[PDB]
Amino acid sequence: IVYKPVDLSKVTSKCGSLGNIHHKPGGGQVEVKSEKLDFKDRVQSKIGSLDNITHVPGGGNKKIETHK
Amino acid sequence: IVYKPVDLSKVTSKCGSLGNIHHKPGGGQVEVKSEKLDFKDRVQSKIGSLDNITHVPGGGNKKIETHK
Amino acid sequence: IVYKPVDLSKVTSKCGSLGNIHHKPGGGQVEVKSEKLDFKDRVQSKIGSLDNITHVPGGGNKKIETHK
Amino acid sequence: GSVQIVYKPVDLSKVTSKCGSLGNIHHKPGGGQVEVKSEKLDFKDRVQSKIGSLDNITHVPGGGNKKIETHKLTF
Amino acid sequence: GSVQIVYKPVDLSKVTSKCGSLGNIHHKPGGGQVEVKSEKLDFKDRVQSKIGSLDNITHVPGGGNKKIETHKLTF
Amino acid sequence: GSVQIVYKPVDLSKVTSKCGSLGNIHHKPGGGQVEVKSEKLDFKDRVQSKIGSLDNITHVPGGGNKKIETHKLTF
């Protein structure tokens, strides 16, 4: 009996933002005038920002191998 | 008996934003004038922002292998 | 009995933000004028910021191997 | 009989280039007042600027001359 | 019989270049007042600037001359 | 019989370059007042600047001369 299994396999995950190009991004002019405004609950505001947000809860690898 | 399986497999996931080009993105002019507004619940606003949001809960690999 | 199983396999995760290019990002001008505003709950505001944000709860690798 | 060759080409030629500004008269030229006001500008790439009341500019990449002569006598 | 060869070519030629600003008259030239006001400017790449009331500029990459003669006598 | 070769080529030619600013008259030139005011400027790469009322500039990369003669007599 000769027993010589060979594993050369790749298991790979590439999750999120990868290899992207962002060349000169951004708006020319952004202007806001706010007068006598009332807010009575939570405010989120973005004015002329650049946001690059990545969440990766995933991308996990499981390899199980058994020999008998 | 010779027992000699060869595994050369690739298992691959490419999840999210990959290899993109964003060349000079953005609006020319953005202008907002707000006067005497009342808000009585949550406000979300984006004014001339650039957002690149990626979520990857997925992209997981499971490889199970047995030999006998 | 000859028993020579060979594992040379790769298990790999590339989770988050990887190999990206951000060449000269940013808006030209951002201007805000605020007068007589009332806020009565939490305010989050971004004015002209650049934010690169990455969360990776995932990307974990598990390899199990057994021989008998 | 005998053989006689006389080879006497004479060259009196002129090759001339006159390029740019030659022999001009500029009598009392007046550049006016120049005002440049800039606020809140953004430049993401290379800037070349010239500001000035009175410019005389002469640029001459050309005006080159090439003269070739071959003289050959084979007996 | 006899052979006589008289190779007597003559060159009196002129090859000439006159490139740029030659022989001009600039009589009382006046560059007026120059004002540059700059506030809150941003430059992310190379800046070249010139500011000035009166400029005379001559640039001459050209005006080169090339003369070739080849004389050959073969008997 | 006899052979006579006379090889007497004459060159009195002229190769001339006159490049740049030559023989000009600048009589009483006036550069006016120059003001440069700068506030809150930002530069992320190389800056070249010149400021001044009156400039005379002559730049000559060219105006070169090349002369070749080959003389060959083969009997």
From Swiss-Prot, chains D, E, F:
Q: Where is this cross-link: Glycyl lysine isopeptide (Lys-Gly) (interchain with G-Cter in ubiquitin)?
A: K8, K14, K18, K28, K40, K44, K50, K66, K72
Which tissue types show expression of this protein?
Answer: Expressed in neurons. Isoform PNS-tau is expressed in the peripheral nervous system while the others are expressed in the central nervous system.
May I ask which residue range the UniProt record assigns to the signal sequence? none
Q: Glycosylation annotated at which residues?
A: K44, K50, K66
**Phosphoserine: residues bearing it:** S2, S21, S49, S53
Disease annotated for this entry: In Alzheimer disease, the neuronal cytoskeleton in the brain is progressively disrupted and replaced by tangles of paired helical filaments (PHF) and straight filaments, mainly composed of hyperphosphorylated forms of TAU (PHF-TAU or AD P-TAU). O-GlcNAcylation is greatly reduced in Alzheimer disease brain cerebral cortex leading to an increase in TAU/MAPT phosphorylations.
- What's written under domain? The tau/MAP repeat binds to tubulin. Type I isoforms contain 3 repeats while type II isoforms contain 4 repeats.
Name the UniProt record assigns to this protein: Microtubule-associated protein tau
Residues represented out of the complete protein: 621 to 695 of 758
